[PDB]
Amino acid sequence: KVFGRCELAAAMKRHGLDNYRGYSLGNWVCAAKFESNFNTQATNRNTDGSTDYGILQINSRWWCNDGRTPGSRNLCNIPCSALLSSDITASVNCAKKIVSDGNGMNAWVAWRNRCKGTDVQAWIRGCRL
Numbered sequence: 001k002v003f004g005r006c007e008l009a010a011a012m013k014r015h016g017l018d019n020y021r022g023y024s025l026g027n028w029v030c031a032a033k034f035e036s037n038f039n040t041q042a043t044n045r046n047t048d049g050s051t052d053y054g055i056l057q058i059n060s061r062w063w064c065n066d067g068r069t070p071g072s073r074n075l076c077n078i079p080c081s082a083l084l085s086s087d088i089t090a091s092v093n094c095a096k097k098i099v100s101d102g103n104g105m106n107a108w109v110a111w112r113n114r115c116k117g118t119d120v121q122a123w124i125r126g127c128r129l
């Protein structure tokens with residue numbers, strides 16, 4: 001599923017991401033935009049052999065099991081394919097573990113490089129939340 005911006009913002013709010021660990025909703029929408037272009041089916045292979053999955057490009061080295069990443073820790077205890085669902089629940093639940101791990105949203109390189117320090121409120125402007 002390719003979400004609309006406001007549609008995604010609303011789904012994220014319902015799943016409790018607004019101000020989760022102090023990160024306002026716009027941060028999460030901005031991260032999803034640049035990681036996946038709001039497409040739940042996005043996959044991208046990394047240089048280390050791991051793969052990133054779904055709307056928030058969650059990695060198979062640490063977070064989910066794709067059966068082809070040796071030494072994967074699967075800390076979200078899920079198959080990576082679960083993260084490609086039109087239902088974002090699994091992605092959101094795993095993202096909450098990731099942002100809690102100590103580096104906050106810096107765990108998402110796209111967020112650090114393209115969202116951090118910008119007017120992220122723009123990402124939810126106009127939306128009926």
Ligand SMILES: [Cl-]
Nearest residue numbers: 021103104105
């Ligand atoms: Cl933080």
Ligand SMILES: [Co+2]
Nearest residue numbers: 052057059109
């Ligand atoms: Co990535």
